Design a protein around this ligand. Sequence first.
Ligand SMILES: O=C(O)[C@H]1O[C@H](O[C@@H]2[C@H](O)[C@@H](O)[C@@H](O[C@@H]3[C@H](O)[C@@H](O)[C@@H](O)O[C@@H]3C(=O)O)O[C@@H]2C(=O)O)[C@H](O)[C@@H](O)[C@H]1O
Ligand SMILES: [Ca+2]
Ligand SMILES: [Ca+2]
Ligand SMILES: [Ca+2]
Ligand SMILES: [Ca+2]
Length: 195
Amino acid sequence: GTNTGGVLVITDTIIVKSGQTYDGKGIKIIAQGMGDGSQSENQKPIFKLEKGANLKNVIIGAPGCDGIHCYGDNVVENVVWEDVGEDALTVKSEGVVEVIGGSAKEAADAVFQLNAPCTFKVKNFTATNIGKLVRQNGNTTFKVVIYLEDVTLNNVKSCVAKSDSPVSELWYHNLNVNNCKTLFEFPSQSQIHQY
Ligand SMILES: O=C(O)[C@H]1O[C@H](O[C@@H]2[C@H](O)[C@@H](O)[C@@H](O[C@@H]3[C@H](O)[C@@H](O)[C@@H](O)O[C@@H]3C(=O)O)O[C@@H]2C(=O)O)[C@H](O)[C@@H](O)[C@H]1O
Ligand SMILES: [Ca+2]
Ligand SMILES: [Ca+2]
Ligand SMILES: [Ca+2]
Ligand SMILES: [Ca+2]
């Protein structure tokens, strides 16, 4: 992309409005004053994607802070997290959220955090050195449906995906996992399906 080689240093969350597409054209973003990328829960998101907002073609440098907050009906395309912060992307409100392309590395805990009922799809994605790829918020029992399609994972220190919800489901297709003791931590393994 034509912003490749540039570094945008920001000091507040970038809000992408409903109906908008933020296209970074390959820019690298470094956030300052928004978090250190540790496990502290009080960091700011790099991006807030309002319902029906899209994001594409961004590299998020360290510190990853609180990553991308999605409010539903969002396409997140070609986003690279060089160093995931507290988490990489959080679904904050109901809708369909797509992560297509890109990659993530160095997530101490979760990459994707699902805090509202949603349909969540990860497609054509790589992640390395992570605690979990997907976590439905603990002890919640609303329904999420997760799809992992063409996803390649390496060095997964807890599990691919974890939910405490019996009604939630995970579907996978062309999933490749290296160095994970425990793929799925759901109430029953019958909640996990191939397609
Ligand atoms: O949106 C968030 O960032 C979310 O973070 C916390 O919750 C997650 C997870 O949903 C919780 O179940 C909990 O996870 C457990 C441990 O606390 C955690 O360090 C790791 O060991 O995983 C555990 C697990 O998956 O069960 O805490 C997670 C976290 O620390 O990020 C908040 O509690 C939640 O309110 C919200 O802010
Ligand atoms: Ca955490
Ligand atoms: Ca957290
Ligand atoms: Ca990290
Ligand atoms: Ca978080």
